[PDB]
C-alpha cells in the first residue's frame, strides 16, 4: 500500500530530524546541564507543550488513515512550537532552524502521501531563557519518540 520509495524517504527524513534534535539536546545538556527530559516533564504541561496523540499508529488501534492524520497534525504542532521557541539563543538558532526546515520537509511528505491516497486532510509564549531551554529539550525528545513510533507503524502497511 505504502510504496517503498515513500518509506525510504520517511526513513531518511526521520533520521535527519532525529539527528538535529540530538544535536540540540547534547548542546543543552553539556552547556547548561538540562540532560534528562524526564525531569522537565511537568514543566511541559505548564509551558503548554502537548504530547500529540498517535493512538492510530499503536498496535491497539492501528489504522492507516488515522495514523497518517495524527502524524501530520503532530508534525504541524511541532512546527508551531519550534517557531515559538525563537531560536532559544543566538548560538542555538542555526540548529533550531535546520530542525524546523527538516521537520517541515517531513510534514510536506506525509501530506502529499495522504493526498495521493485519497485521505485528503496560538502557541505558548516562552518568556525566559530557562523556559526556551526547557521547551527545546522537551520538543526535541518528544519529536524523536513520536517519529520512531509513527515510522514503526508506517512500516507495517508496507510496499
From Swiss-Prot:
Query: Which keywords annotate this record?
Result: Cytokine, Disulfide bond, Glycoprotein, Growth factor, Secreted
Q: Name one GO cellular component term.
A: extracellular space
Keyword Secreted set for record: yes
Presence of the UniProt keyword Membrane in the record: no
Gene3D superfamilies named among the record's database cross-references: 1.20.1250.10
Single Gene Ontology BP annotation? immune response
- SMART domains documented for this protein: IL6
Q: List the disulfide bonds.
A: 29-35, 57-67
Q: Where in the cell is it found?
A: Secreted
Q: Where is this chain primarily localised?
A: secreted
Q: How is it modified after translation?
A: O-glycosylated.
**InterPro entries reported for this sequence:** 4_helix_cytokine-like_core, GCSF/MGF, IL-6/GCSF/MGF, IL6/GCSF/MGF_CS
**Coiled-coil blocks:** none
Query: What would you give as a GO molecular function for this chain, any one?
Result: granulocyte colony-stimulating factor receptor binding
Which PANTHER family did the record assign? GRANULOCYTE COLONY-STIMULATING FACTOR
The record's note on quaternary structure and interaction partners says: Monomer.
Tell me the function of this protein. Answer: Granulocyte/macrophage colony-stimulating factors are cytokines that act in hematopoiesis by controlling the production, differentiation, and function of 2 related white cell populations of the blood, the granulocytes and the monocytes-macrophages. This CSF induces granulocytes.
Membership in a protein family: Belongs to the IL-6 superfamily.
Q: What is this protein called?
A: Granulocyte colony-stimulating factor
**Source organism:** Canis lupus familiaris (Dog)
* Upper taxonomic lineage: Eukaryota, Metazoa, Chordata, Craniata, Vertebrata
Q: Which gene encodes it?
A: CSF3
